A paper describes a structure:
Nirmatrelvir (antiviral component in Paxlovid) binds covalently to the active site cysteine of the main protease of SARS-CoV-2 (Mpro), thereby blocking enzyme activity and halting viral replication. In vitro passage experiments mimicking a multi-dosage nirmatrelvir treatment regime, identified Mpro variants with mutations in the active site and near the C-terminal dimerization interface with variable levels of nirmatrelvir resistance. One such variant harbors a triple mutation in Mpro, L50F/E166A/L167F, that displays decreased potency for nirmatrelvir (IC50 ∼ 850–1600 nM) and ibuzatrelvir while viral replication remained similar to that of the wildtype (WT) virus.
To confirm our hypothesis, we performed co-crystallization of the triple mutant with compound 4. The resulting structure complex was solved to 1.9 Å in the P21212 space group. Here, we see the P3 4-methoxy indole fits in the S3/S4 position of the Mpro active site where it is stabilized by hydrogen bond coordination with the backbone amide of A166. The P1 2-oxopyrrolidine also forms weak hydrogen bonds with residues G143 and S144, adjacent to the active site cysteine. Upon further observation, the E166A mutation alters the packing of the Mpro dimer. When the E166A mutation is present, the N-finger is unable to form a hydrogen bond with A166 resulting in a dimer that is less stable relative to its wild-type, further supported by reduced stability when measured using differential scanning fluorometry (Tm 49.5 °C vs. 59.7 °C). Additionally, with a small, non-polar methyl group in place of a polar carboxylate group, surface charge of the S1 pocket is lost and becomes more hydrophobic. The L50F mutation is also located adjacent to the active site, forming the entrance of the substrate binding groove. The phenylalanine causes widening of the S2 pocket, as previously observed in the single mutation, causing a shift towards a more open conformation. A co-crystal structure highlights a flat, extended aromatic P3 group, the lack of bifurcation towards S3, and a small cyclopropyl alanine P2 group as beneficial structural features to ensure tight and universal binding.
Numbering used by the authors:
A (entry chain A), B (entry chain A): 1 to 305
Write the structure that this text describes.
């Protein structure tokens, strides 16, 4: 009953957040076993940001130049190394609150929860989608770098995002936990254009299925379409093409609700061509594309962790 | 940079969630010190729901009739008592993860985070507002009763909501943790009309201030209004009257942005009378009223817990 943008419970990730200070810069790190993972630009100065030689800057630094605090406890650094755009700080204490975890590189269209942190301390949690242009629309202030994004599956935390930078228009960019950026961005203060974003078609369809499950049906029309004729309209409206793999992924939702995927497409096609005409869908006046099919099923069947 | 509906980190509340079983019914409870708090209708049968004598039903029950599980650990019940619509189960073990906490009865217009739980296990977290008609728009399935809503202030969890029931239209109702319902509802399966809801004016104004802080200014007009002429338009549009206490509460936001509260009102008045004309505000096509002034300041100044 009801449908909300829902984040994963954040307690397993809260117990892993730490503060990392090198010189004047303080940001957040992720403490798993005896390793702290943080963005490498913590070793930069204000004037290094425009073109840092990260490898050279790291030469200057010794283990003791890294202050790592977990709450009020200082963690002794005993090894440091770079992996892509992330720093790995080996510490002499293993995090006793380490959950079962994996590092995963997510694909565009997938969603995850963000635990926004400042000074090693969690501020809030919200749900984000990795946009087709490899950005995310989050809420991050100065000092938020090192905040992570994650999914939970029973007991396993799958970390998929670490925050590195913000751009004009509330656009945020980051890396996986192996340090590789999503999309063509660098941890450098230079002109960096995010590509044009598009709407995640399969997530819109998922959210329409969620509307029917929850009672909204005014938009269900009397038509059907082929896959090809739908992707002609999607491209005109800056929607991702719908692939057969997407059709298969909506399968279980189609079976629950009795609406074949291509009938939902016909209903979507008319929403894009005529608009909503003042009406709302699940309390929204815009088509929502930040729910995956799996997000819908979770919320609607009550999957716990 | 960016603005999102943001929940509090839920880890302090996760460590308090337990499963309570009496007979066939299982729901969630909140374990603080040596006490478990849960909705009293856990002692009901399917046919008792229409008109339960809760006091009489509780006579039948003994301490051992209550199964309380925290994860895989069974907690021994050693005392039971009713307080309004909540049950208090004294247990022989004190929750070692009890945070600093208070029980608070919130006022309409205030927001809080909900930790939706099933079988004592957290499923997700999201942010809700207590509507003027004393309902909330959440996402709750069968088995969600006992899930709680809360705010966090530095280290203190202020519990303000416990979930008891759902009504047609994704409308949800519950109690404070002293067991008293918000609004005129009873824990009975009978016809129960929620009053007409209205829009929380002061939260809309807060969210407009958040838009200006974040860069959206197209809606700022060249006009001002008095308090009285604004409340004439608000009432026509099902908006709560704006009180001087609300004007004072928006004070700090007005000072940050340089927009006097009554100028924002003039800008709001024109949005209500002409609509948005296809435009969006902070990525929304509807005026949003589930951010308090304090929610805006938190998100925009980076308050941590
Ligand atoms: C890390 O705390 C910080 C997070 C930012 C502040 C956030 O989410 N809101 C501010 N990251 C940060 O400042 C980046 C620095 C490391 C990558 C080197 N830089 C930026 O985020 C940044 C650079 C630019 C820019 O360069 C030109 C133009 C416009 C905006 C911008 N933002
Ligand atoms: C507790 O798990 C459960 C939560 C519900 C199911 C939820 O959030 N989605 C289902 N609470 C529950 O079922 C309530 C029982 C205790 C108060 C006695 N009852 C209802 O929620 C309820 C009663 C009615 C009704 O009576 C007439 C008409 C329409 C809807 C309704 N819902």
């Amino acid at each position: 009953s009801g449908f909300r943008k829902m984040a994963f419970p954040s307690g397993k990730v809260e117990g892993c957040m730490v503060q990392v200070t090198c010189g004047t810069t303080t940001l957040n790190g992720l403490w798993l076993d005896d390793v702290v993972y943080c963005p490498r630009h913590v070793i930069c100065t204000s004037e290094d940001m425009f073109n840092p030689n990260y490898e050279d800057l790291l030469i200057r630094k010794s283990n003791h130049n890294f202050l790592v605090q977990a709450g009020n406890v200082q963690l002794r650094v005993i090894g440091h190394s770079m992996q892509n755009c992330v720093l790995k700080l080996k510490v002499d204490t293993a995090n006793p609150k380490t959950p079962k975890y994996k590092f995963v590189r997510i694909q565009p269209g997938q969603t995850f929860s963000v635990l926004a942190c400042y000074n090693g301390s969690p501020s809030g949690v919200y749900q984000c989608a990795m946009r087709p242009n490899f950005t995310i629309k989050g809420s991050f202030l100065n000092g938020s770098c090192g905040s992570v994004g994650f999914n939970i599956d029973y007991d396993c935390v799958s970390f998929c995002y670490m925050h590195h930078m913000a751009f004009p228009t509330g656009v945020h960019a980051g890396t996986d936990l192996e340090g590789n950026f999503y999309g063509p961005f660098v941890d450098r203060q230079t002109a960096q254009a995010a590509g044009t974003d598009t709407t995640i078609t399969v997530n819109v369809l998922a959210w329409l299925y969620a509307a029917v499950i929850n009672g909204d049906r005014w938009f269900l029309n009397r038509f059907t379409t082929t896959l090809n004729d739908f992707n002609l309209v999607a491209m005109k409206y800056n929607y991702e093409p719908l692939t057969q793999d997407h059709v298969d992924i909506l399968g279980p939702l189609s079976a629950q609700t009795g609406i074949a995927v291509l009938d939902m497409c016909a209903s979507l096609k008319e929403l894009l061509q005529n608009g909503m005409n003042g009406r709302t869908i699940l309390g929204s006046a815009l088509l929502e594309d930040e729910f995956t099919p799996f997000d819908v099923v979770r919320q609607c069947s009550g999957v716990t962790f």
